[PDB]
Design a protein around this motif. Structure first.
Motif, PDB file in Angstrom:
ATOM      1  N   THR A  53      41.068  19.728  39.080  1.00  0.00           N
ATOM      2  CA  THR A  53      40.498  21.060  38.911  1.00  0.00           C
ATOM      3  C   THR A  53      41.434  22.094  39.519  1.00  0.00           C
ATOM      4  O   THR A  53      41.865  21.949  40.668  1.00  0.00           O
ATOM      5  CB  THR A  53      39.108  21.180  39.543  1.00  0.00           C
ATOM      6  N   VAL A  54      41.744  23.131  38.744  1.00  0.00           N
ATOM      7  CA  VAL A  54      42.612  24.198  39.226  1.00  0.00           C
ATOM      8  C   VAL A  54      41.873  24.975  40.306  1.00  0.00           C
ATOM      9  O   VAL A  54      40.788  25.518  40.067  1.00  0.00           O
ATOM     10  CB  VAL A  54      43.044  25.117  38.077  1.00  0.00           C
ATOM     11  N   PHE A  55      42.456  25.029  41.499  1.00  0.00           N
ATOM     12  CA  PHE A  55      41.867  25.736  42.624  1.00  0.00           C
ATOM     13  C   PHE A  55      42.687  26.980  42.924  1.00  0.00           C
ATOM     14  O   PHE A  55      43.921  26.927  42.977  1.00  0.00           O
ATOM     15  CB  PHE A  55      41.790  24.845  43.868  1.00  0.00           C
ATOM     16  N   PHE A  56      41.995  28.098  43.120  1.00  0.00           N
ATOM     17  CA  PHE A  56      42.621  29.382  43.381  1.00  0.00           C
ATOM     18  C   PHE A  56      42.302  29.825  44.801  1.00  0.00           C
ATOM     19  O   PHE A  56      41.321  29.379  45.402  1.00  0.00           O
ATOM     20  CB  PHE A  56      42.154  30.443  42.377  1.00  0.00           C
ATOM     21  N   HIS A  57      43.153  30.706  45.335  1.00  0.00           N
ATOM     22  CA  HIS A  57      42.997  31.150  46.716  1.00  0.00           C
ATOM     23  C   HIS A  57      41.668  31.861  46.934  1.00  0.00           C
ATOM     24  O   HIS A  57      41.116  31.822  48.041  1.00  0.00           O
ATOM     25  CB  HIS A  57      44.158  32.065  47.105  1.00  0.00           C
ATOM     26  N   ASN A  58      41.140  32.510  45.900  1.00  0.00           N
ATOM     27  CA  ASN A  58      39.851  33.178  45.984  1.00  0.00           C
ATOM     28  C   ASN A  58      39.273  33.312  44.581  1.00  0.00           C
ATOM     29  O   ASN A  58      39.949  33.059  43.581  1.00  0.00           O
ATOM     30  CB  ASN A  58      39.966  34.538  46.690  1.00  0.00           C
ATOM     31  N   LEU A  59      37.999  33.705  44.521  1.00  0.00           N
ATOM     32  CA  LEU A  59      37.342  33.877  43.230  1.00  0.00           C
ATOM     33  C   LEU A  59      37.975  35.002  42.424  1.00  0.00           C
ATOM     34  O   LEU A  59      37.961  34.964  41.189  1.00  0.00           O
ATOM     35  CB  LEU A  59      35.851  34.140  43.430  1.00  0.00           C
ATOM     36  N   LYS A  60      38.531  36.011  43.099  1.00  0.00           N
ATOM     37  CA  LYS A  60      39.176  37.111  42.390  1.00  0.00           C
ATOM     38  C   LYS A  60      40.361  36.619  41.570  1.00  0.00           C
ATOM     39  O   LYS A  60      40.517  36.992  40.401  1.00  0.00           O
ATOM     40  CB  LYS A  60      39.621  38.183  43.383  1.00  0.00           C
ATOM     41  N   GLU A  61      41.203  35.771  42.167  1.00  0.00           N
ATOM     42  CA  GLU A  61      42.351  35.236  41.442  1.00  0.00           C
ATOM     43  C   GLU A  61      41.905  34.372  40.272  1.00  0.00           C
ATOM     44  O   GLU A  61      42.500  34.429  39.190  1.00  0.00           O
ATOM     45  CB  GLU A  61      43.246  34.439  42.391  1.00  0.00           C
ATOM     46  N   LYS A  62      40.859  33.568  40.466  1.00  0.00           N
ATOM     47  CA  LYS A  62      40.358  32.727  39.384  1.00  0.00           C
ATOM     48  C   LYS A  62      39.838  33.570  38.227  1.00  0.00           C
ATOM     49  O   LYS A  62      40.131  33.292  37.058  1.00  0.00           O
ATOM     50  CB  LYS A  62      39.260  31.800  39.904  1.00  0.00           C
ATOM     51  N   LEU A  63      39.055  34.605  38.536  1.00  0.00           N
ATOM     52  CA  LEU A  63      38.519  35.465  37.488  1.00  0.00           C
ATOM     53  C   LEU A  63      39.634  36.200  36.757  1.00  0.00           C
ATOM     54  O   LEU A  63      39.607  36.312  35.525  1.00  0.00           O
ATOM     55  CB  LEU A  63      37.521  36.457  38.083  1.00  0.00           C
ATOM     56  N   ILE A  81      29.605  39.536  41.448  1.00  0.00           N
ATOM     57  CA  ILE A  81      30.043  38.257  40.895  1.00  0.00           C
ATOM     58  C   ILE A  81      30.259  37.238  42.007  1.00  0.00           C
ATOM     59  O   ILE A  81      29.885  36.066  41.881  1.00  0.00           O
ATOM     60  CB  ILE A  81      31.312  38.450  40.049  1.00  0.00           C
ATOM     61  N   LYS A  82      30.881  37.666  43.108  1.00  0.00           N
ATOM     62  CA  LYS A  82      31.101  36.761  44.231  1.00  0.00           C
ATOM     63  C   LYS A  82      29.781  36.298  44.832  1.00  0.00           C
ATOM     64  O   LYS A  82      29.632  35.124  45.185  1.00  0.00           O
ATOM     65  CB  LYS A  82      31.971  37.443  45.286  1.00  0.00           C
ATOM     66  N   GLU A  83      28.807  37.204  44.955  1.00  0.00           N
ATOM     67  CA  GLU A  83      27.496  36.809  45.461  1.00  0.00           C
ATOM     68  C   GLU A  83      26.815  35.823  44.520  1.00  0.00           C
ATOM     69  O   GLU A  83      26.167  34.871  44.968  1.00  0.00           O
ATOM     70  CB  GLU A  83      26.617  38.042  45.674  1.00  0.00           C
ATOM     71  N   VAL A  84      26.953  36.034  43.209  1.00  0.00           N
ATOM     72  CA  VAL A  84      26.374  35.107  42.240  1.00  0.00           C
ATOM     73  C   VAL A  84      27.002  33.724  42.376  1.00  0.00           C
ATOM     74  O   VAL A  84      26.301  32.702  42.389  1.00  0.00           O
ATOM     75  CB  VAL A  84      26.535  35.672  40.816  1.00  0.00           C
ATOM     76  N   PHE A  85      28.331  33.670  42.489  1.00  0.00           N
ATOM     77  CA  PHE A  85      29.008  32.384  42.636  1.00  0.00           C
ATOM     78  C   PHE A  85      28.638  31.708  43.951  1.00  0.00           C
ATOM     79  O   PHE A  85      28.490  30.483  44.004  1.00  0.00           O
ATOM     80  CB  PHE A  85      30.520  32.567  42.526  1.00  0.00           C
ATOM     81  N   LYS A  86      28.489  32.489  45.025  1.00  0.00           N
ATOM     82  CA  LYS A  86      28.019  31.931  46.289  1.00  0.00           C
ATOM     83  C   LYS A  86      26.620  31.349  46.140  1.00  0.00           C
ATOM     84  O   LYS A  86      26.322  30.283  46.689  1.00  0.00           O
ATOM     85  CB  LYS A  86      28.035  33.005  47.377  1.00  0.00           C
ATOM     86  N   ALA A 127      25.370  30.101  43.420  1.00  0.00           N
ATOM     87  CA  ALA A 127      25.516  28.842  42.695  1.00  0.00           C
ATOM     88  C   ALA A 127      25.990  27.723  43.612  1.00  0.00           C
ATOM     89  O   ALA A 127      25.469  26.603  43.557  1.00  0.00           O
ATOM     90  CB  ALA A 127      26.481  29.018  41.525  1.00  0.00           C
ATOM     91  N   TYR A 128      26.971  28.006  44.468  1.00  0.00           N
ATOM     92  CA  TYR A 128      27.511  27.001  45.372  1.00  0.00           C
ATOM     93  C   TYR A 128      26.681  26.815  46.634  1.00  0.00           C
ATOM     94  O   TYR A 128      26.890  25.831  47.352  1.00  0.00           O
ATOM     95  CB  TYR A 128      28.953  27.355  45.753  1.00  0.00           C
ATOM     96  N   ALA A 129      25.751  27.728  46.927  1.00  0.00           N
ATOM     97  CA  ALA A 129      24.885  27.545  48.087  1.00  0.00           C
ATOM     98  C   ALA A 129      23.943  26.363  47.902  1.00  0.00           C
ATOM     99  O   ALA A 129      23.545  25.728  48.886  1.00  0.00           O
ATOM    100  CB  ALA A 129      24.084  28.817  48.361  1.00  0.00           C
ATOM    101  N   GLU A 146      28.967  24.614  38.970  1.00  0.00           N
ATOM    102  CA  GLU A 146      28.561  25.861  39.600  1.00  0.00           C
ATOM    103  C   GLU A 146      29.321  27.065  39.063  1.00  0.00           C
ATOM    104  O   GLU A 146      28.877  28.197  39.278  1.00  0.00           O
ATOM    105  CB  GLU A 146      28.749  25.759  41.113  1.00  0.00           C
ATOM    106  N   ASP A 147      30.445  26.856  38.382  1.00  0.00           N
ATOM    107  CA  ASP A 147      31.202  27.927  37.746  1.00  0.00           C
ATOM    108  C   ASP A 147      30.717  28.240  36.343  1.00  0.00           C
ATOM    109  O   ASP A 147      30.521  29.409  36.006  1.00  0.00           O
ATOM    110  CB  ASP A 147      32.688  27.563  37.693  1.00  0.00           C
ATOM    111  N   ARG A 148      30.514  27.210  35.518  1.00  0.00           N
ATOM    112  CA  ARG A 148      29.917  27.416  34.205  1.00  0.00           C
ATOM    113  C   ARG A 148      28.520  28.008  34.319  1.00  0.00           C
ATOM    114  O   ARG A 148      28.173  28.922  33.563  1.00  0.00           O
ATOM    115  CB  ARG A 148      29.878  26.094  33.438  1.00  0.00           C
TER     116      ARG A 148
END
Ligand SMILES: Nc1ncnc2c1ncn2[C@@H]1O[C@H](COP(=O)(O)OP(=O)(O)OP(=O)(O)O)[C@@H](O)[C@H]1O
Ligand SMILES: Nc1ncnc2c1ncn2[C@@H]1O[C@H](COP(=O)(O)OP(=O)(O)OP(=O)(O)O)[C@@H](O)[C@H]1O
Ligand SMILES: Cc1cn([C@H]2C[C@H](O)[C@@H](COP(=O)(O)OP(=O)(O)OP(=O)(O)O)O2)c(=O)[nH]c1=O
Ligand SMILES: Cc1cn([C@H]2C[C@H](O)[C@@H](COP(=O)(O)OP(=O)(O)OP(=O)(O)O)O2)c(=O)[nH]c1=O
Ligand SMILES: Nc1nc2c(ncn2[C@@H]2O[C@H](COP(=O)(O)OP(=O)(O)O)[C@@H](O)[C@H]2O)c(=O)[nH]1
Ligand SMILES: Nc1nc2c(ncn2[C@@H]2O[C@H](COP(=O)(O)OP(=O)(O)O)[C@@H](O)[C@H]2O)c(=O)[nH]1
Ligand SMILES: [Mg+2]
Ligand SMILES: [Mg+2]
Lengths: 683, 86, 12, 683, 12
Positions: D40-50, D72-77, D79-81, D114-116
């Motif tokens: 899985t491609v991992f990015f330094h932060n969600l901003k870079e991934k988006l 968007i970051k809160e939504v992803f958090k 999902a991963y929470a 959690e990303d999809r």
């Protein structure tokens, strides 16, 4: 067995070692007296017949309304004033089985030959009694034969269209492919043959919107069109015949050709789609030099250059495509591909070989478009523009799709009447009327090109019959001299009639000013070379007829420059395999296949001797299979130089000759200027 | 007495009769003249004699056709055909 | 009967 | 073999007489650690991934632009929470092989679960952060599962359509058939399955413009549709799937069924076209009394009455058709046709059986149209109006064509969280958003009906999983009681959410006033019958959740009468196939086919026990083929009475059960109110 | 098999 068939069966019963050719006249007399007159419904007067046919949805009331009843009556009288007698049993049988109007139960005959001719003449004239009688004299003398759709459906209500053929340009999109299927089914419903250009379709394994290797190539479209033509097969009266044309530099050319292989599986094999191959001069150059050639992916070329592969000049753009890393391509052997073409023609008669540069070197409308493909009979070579059919509720960019209105001159009857000029002009007027009265609402591009181009097809037939009945061998140089002179006169008078129509109507075909007719490039070889017969025997045939000289061609060129040309295309020689029987003529300008055709209609065989075949001209009616195909190529190239469109050139081959002989004939045709090759018939 | 052979270059049976006529000329050429006419180049003569198939062999005597044979024939059959009229 | 093109067939 | 696959194969390695079900969790851990976390491609932060995903044309920018990056970051958090963990290896394998976003070279993985889920939630909310977090909680709890098109393509640029189905009405014309082919291809390229109603097409041997015996029937149209779906094969990644539906009283019904016979020749056989048969109650009545039935030619009925055969109530007009001499028909045997249906379903699983009167007895929108046909999954039952597609440059009469806006409730996770109301309302909102954002330009009727009817499909899955994991046999009456209560709750809250959306937007669906929702006829059985559980064990399952009562249904009926209803249709139970693995659920409301699924992937043999399977509930997870089909019919009919559309009801048949048994199951389904029967799966 | 229907399979 019927009496007429038994009398016709007596042709091959040789007495004194000679064929009983006089039995065919007895056969036709018996046929008429015992079947046709008995099964023809008769009315007390022509008024009752016309009223019955109009009221019973047999005739259109619109086309008969422009004439007073006395005018129609006198047209019919001048049709019967000829007292036309069919010369052979097969002529009458074919007419009264295929074209004569019959009742709804197909039990009684409603139309004689002189009634079909009268109705077609009244349709052609459109309110002119004198012109209607001129058309009646033209057709009853059998100097001009309207195409089978026109002859069969003129003035009828239960009719399709009067156009014999349609050529569709298929663009590279799903909307365009679906619309092409729709238009193919619509035009097959109308009864006309449909030819489709698949060279713009992107290759197999190409990208669909960033989705790579998703396309099925042109072969999926061939399967779709094949099932469309099977579905819209005119209910079973005659199987839906369609044509697919692909450039030889398309990547799918091998897959396109494999559809006609016997060993091909049903998932890749088409059955109702005739296939044609467009061969630019570049392919012949590559095969001659034995260099490895490349077939290209059309969508890569479109993305790189913005134009479709068949829209660009192959001879100029081939090296640029090969040197372009962004243009995807695969390596092929052009000589191996030529051998594959030859073996495919030997085994199945396909594909239709079209030499694109042979068409476009003398094409008058190259400014409008190059001729990228031919029709189902490989004789309609016209400029066409692809239509960009957009999404629903989005306006479509309608292009030009070729519609061909065909008509045939009977060379024997035209020459015996010394009426080349009048026959050609009347035929041009009739074809113009057919083009004008024809509208097709479900094919926007066909309708647009019919209105704008006004292209007509004036073919010829009974060339071999006329030559043999005049003691001229079809392969002899005298025959080629006669073809040269006759077709030069035909072209002269067709151009003259087109210019006269443009003057009378004040309008020329769309984009005429950019054509070679306007610039005078078309008439260069006519104002430079004299096409009068070089043999005194041939020149004696044109006695009493004014052969257009160089000065006459200069005058015609000036007249065309001053007044324009109404028709973009005028001359195209169709095979005319069906109406040839009725006119007692050999099919097209092709040599005869058999001296006495053997045909089985039911449980009885019906022999058809060639028109005018006898003991004194037995060896002049040389069968096409026994003839040198190089001489036939020479003849067709002599004819083709006076025909702006193509000629349905069928290759008649023996089983002894190999695929190399077929390739040699193909290359000789390409070298001699042959535009298209129709079929490879093997005996 | 003349044996006239109506032939063509494309006719397979006409190629088979050619060597038979050469042997016949060697054996009988003092009493028999052999004449060949190509029907592809000479349609008027083929038409005059009502020839509709090839090879067609006409035996002529003093300008009149006395016998007609159609198709391939071996030497002995051609000798019998000509010897009737010598 | 497949017979390969042997050149000299492109010239007439 | 891979470590995770090897660990998965230890499920069937039995120790101490018990399956090693605990090895599956080890399989998930091994799969993730050794394959997923590495690839899985991992990015330094969600901003870079988006930024990487939008810039590289992986995501659409329009839906992400409605949110600030903080949202968007809160939504992803959110999902991963949850820290969601797949409980079976097959779930993770399905997601990360089918639905997880991968790079253009497919070497790496771009999307986690959690990303999809976060991207789908952000798409659904349309600028609302709280709604996006609610959707994230709904999907990461696995309470609601958007359909495969919606889950896959939400917020992605390289996509198709979020719509799962397309139900097309084909009118009796060549233009309409050509447009049907075009629309079928244009909707197959979008990914969704296409179903076509061919009952309006006139039969074989009908007239085309007063010439008799001209049509080749609906079989030719099925050939065209089959080749159209084969051509639009979606790269071949998923073959083009299409359905064709025909009324059993259509004359071509025998030839319609003959195309699915194995012995059928390639000249009639269709491969990619699924077939369904629409059976009105009249056919069942005729079969019951063993009286001769009649199949009618649709065009004769259209000519005589001015209306299509399938627009007229056959229970009323069958006698009128029979005693009408101007209506063409042939005598058939209804019992022989039923036996033919049974043997066809035994041999191939086709056709889908649609009981038209069962559908239309409780159809709310009969005023708009009666339900004439179903979808490819035989579960969508909506009113459709045919579109009269006219000739070019003529305005077309656009009708209504049905589309699937599908989503599934996970009954297990829905009832564990005691959130039937919240899940149903959020799913209804998401499906409403999917329907609103769908704009299909090449299908006019589909787009018009999507805008007008605003129909959505809210299905349920994991019924058997929930019942078996709660110690309830699927055939037990307690299971039917639970299904009754649960689906009455689902219907109550779907109607409530539809009425709330109608109130908040001020608009209902088109022609709502004529529907039974407006007249109150729909709520009759809900205000007259109490659907609370009759079993104490079942009533304890709903503890902590307010079960709607008769008075609550009366209040809902009043609310709908005052405010209207936004969706014409809300509930339809899809088969819920490959996405059922990802949710760790049994497919649809169907019973499980096998306790442990034996699946082949590459060179490996993978095993998937149904979720929650263990020693204690081994016999509760009874295999579907072992079940009594009559009790499964009872279960579905109990569910069916609360679903306004149909249910994808698959019949699971043993090898020993004959065609009479299949016919008995079909007739019991018809008697019990089953609307559609999907498949006949024989073991 | 291909067992035919009887009159009693239409009532339940
Ligand atoms: N060879 C033929 N071609 C065309 N029609 C024929 C032919 N023979 C007979 N008929 C038709 O049958 C009818 C009767 O034949 P017949 O030749 O006896 O008629 P006719 O009018 O008396 O002849 P004539 O032309 O000698 O005056 C003709 O009027 C014609 O309609
Ligand atoms: N059974 C599983 N189901 C789903 N994802 C898993 C599973 N096991 C591991 N993963 C994934 O692999 C990652 C690392 O696996 P591991 O079990 O070692 O995590 P962890 O760091 O110990 O767990 P946690 O983050 O809950 O403390 C997890 O964060 C998760 O994304
Ligand atoms: C043209 C054509 C039509 N059909 C059938 C399918 C269509 O459902 C049906 C209608 O075709 P239409 O396009 O409606 O033909 P039409 O309008 O001329 O006929 P009519 O006026 O009598 O309605 O005909 C074929 O089966 N094969 C064909 O080739
Ligand atoms: C949809 C589809 C297209 N094609 C091929 C045939 C067409 O000539 C070609 C053009 O498809 P298009 O419909 O033009 O594809 P597109 O417009 O969505 O994307 P793009 O313009 O970038 O290609 O794709 C198939 O072979 N099979 C299919 O299912
Ligand atoms: N009488 C008659 N003439 C027909 C029919 N069909 C075609 N014709 C031709 O149409 C022309 C009509 O002329 P007609 O009315 O017979 O003139 P009349 O001889 O003075 O009565 C004739 O020359 C016929 O050859 C038919 O059914 N009846
Ligand atoms: N860093 C990172 N986070 C991701 C990625 N994909 C999804 N996420 C999730 O997006 C949310 C945002 O994480 P991040 O930007 O690193 O927040 P931070 O810890 O404050 O820097 C986290 O909850 C992650 O679980 C990724 O590729 N990289
Ligand atoms: Mg495109
Ligand atoms: Mg119609």
């Amino acid at each position: 067995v019927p009496k007429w068939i038994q009398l016709n069966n007596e042709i091959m019963i040789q007495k004194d070692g000679k064929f009983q050719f006089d039995k065919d006249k007895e056969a036709v007399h018996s046929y008429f007296v015992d079947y046709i007159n008995q099964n023809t419904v008769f009315f007390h007067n022509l008024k009752e017949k016309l009223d019955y046919l109009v009221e019973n949805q047999y005739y259109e009331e619109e086309f008969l309304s422009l004439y007073s009843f006395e005018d129609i009556k006198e047209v019919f009288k001048t049709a019967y004033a000829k007292k036309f007698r069919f010369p052979s049993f097969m002529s009458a049988f074919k007419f009264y089985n295929d074209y004569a109007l019959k009742t709804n139960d197909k039990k009684k005959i409603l139309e004689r030959y002189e009634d079909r001719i009268s109705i077609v003449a009244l349709f052609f004239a459109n309110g002119d009694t004198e012109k209607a009688k001129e058309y009646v004299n033209l057709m009853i003398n059998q100097e001009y034969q309207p195409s089978t759709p026109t002859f069969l459906n003129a003035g009828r209500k239960r009719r399709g269209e009067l156009v014999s053929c349609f050529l569709l340009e298929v663009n590279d999109s799903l909307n365009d492919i679906s619309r092409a299927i729709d238009i193919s089914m619509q035009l097959s419903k109308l009864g006309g043959g449909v030819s489709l250009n698949l060279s713009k379709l992107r290759a197999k394994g190409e990208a669909i919107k960033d989705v790579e290797n998703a396309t099925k190539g042109v072969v999926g479209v061939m399967k779709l069109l094949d099932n469309a033509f099977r579905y819209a097969d005119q209910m079973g009266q005659r199987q839906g015949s369609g044509a697919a044309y692909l450039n030889i530099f398309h990547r799918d050319i091998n897959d396109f050709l494999d559809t006609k292989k016997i060993s091909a599986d049903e998932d890749v094999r088409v059955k109702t789609l005739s296939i044609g191959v467009v061969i630019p001069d570049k392919f012949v150059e590559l095969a001659r030099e034995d260099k490895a050639a490349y077939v290209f992916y059309p969508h890569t070329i479109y993305k790189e250059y913005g134009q479709h592969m068949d829209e660009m000049d192959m001879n100029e753009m081939y090296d640029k495509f090969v040197d372009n890393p962004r243009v995807k391509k695969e390596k092929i052997n052009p000589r191996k591909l030529l051998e594959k073409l030859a073996m495919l023609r030997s085994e199945s008669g396909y594909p239709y070989i079209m030499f694109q540069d042979n068409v476009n070197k003398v094409h008058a409308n190259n400014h409008i478009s190059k001729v990228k493909f031919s029709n189902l009979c490989s004789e309609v070579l016209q400029a066409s523009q692809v239509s960009s059919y957009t999404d629903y509720d989005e306006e479509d960019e309608i292009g030009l799709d070729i519609s061909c209105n065909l008509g045939s001159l009977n060379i024997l009857n035209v020459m015996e009447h010394k009426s080349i000029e009048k026959t050609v002009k009347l035929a041009t007027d009739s074809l113009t009327h057919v083009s004008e009265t024809t509208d097709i609402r479900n094919a926007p591009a066909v309708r647009r090109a019919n209105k704008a181009m006004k292209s007509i097809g004036l073919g010829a037939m009974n060339l071999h019959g006329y030559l043999a009945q005049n003691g001229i061998a079809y392969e002899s140089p005298e025959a080629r001299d006669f073809a040269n002179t006759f077709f030069m006169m035909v072209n002269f008078y067709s151009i003259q009639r087109s210019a006269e129509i443009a003057k009378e109507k004040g309008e020329t075909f769309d984009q005429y000013e950019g054509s070679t007719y306007a610039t005078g490039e078309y008439f260069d070889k006519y104002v430079s070379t004299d096409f009068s017969p070089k043999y005194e025997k041939i020149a004696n045939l044109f006695e009493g007829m004014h052969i257009p000289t160089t000065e006459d061609w200069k005058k015609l060129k000036a007249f065309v420059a001053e007044h324009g040309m109404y028709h973009s295309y005028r001359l195209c020689i169709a095979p005319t395999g069906s109406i040839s029987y009725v006119q007692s003529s050999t099919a097209s300008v092709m040599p005869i296949m058999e001296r006495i055709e053997e045909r089985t209609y039911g449980n009885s065989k019906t022999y058809y001797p060639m028109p005018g075949l006898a003991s004194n001209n037995w060896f002049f009616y040389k069968e096409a299979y026994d003839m040198d195909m190089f001489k036939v190529v020479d003849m067709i190239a002599t004819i083709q130089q006076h025909i702006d469109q193509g000629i349905s050139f069928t290759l008649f081959l023996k089983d002894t000759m190999t695929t190399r002989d077929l390739n040699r004939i193909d290359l000789y045709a390409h070298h001699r200027g042959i535009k298209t090759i129709y079929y490879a018939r093997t005996k | 007495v003349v044996l006239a052979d109506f032939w063509a270059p494309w006719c397979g049976p006409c190629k088979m009769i050619a060597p038979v006529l050469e042997e016949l000329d060697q054996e009988m050429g003092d009493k028999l003249k052999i004449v060949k006419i190509d029907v592809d180049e000479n349609q008027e003569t083929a038409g005059k004699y009502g020839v509709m198939s090839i090879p067609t062999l006409l035996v002529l005597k003093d300008g009149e056709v006395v016998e007609t044979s159609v198709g391939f024939k071996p030497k002995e059959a051609l000798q019998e055909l000509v010897n009737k009229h010598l | 009967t497949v017979e390969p093109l042997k050149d000299d067939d492109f010239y007439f």
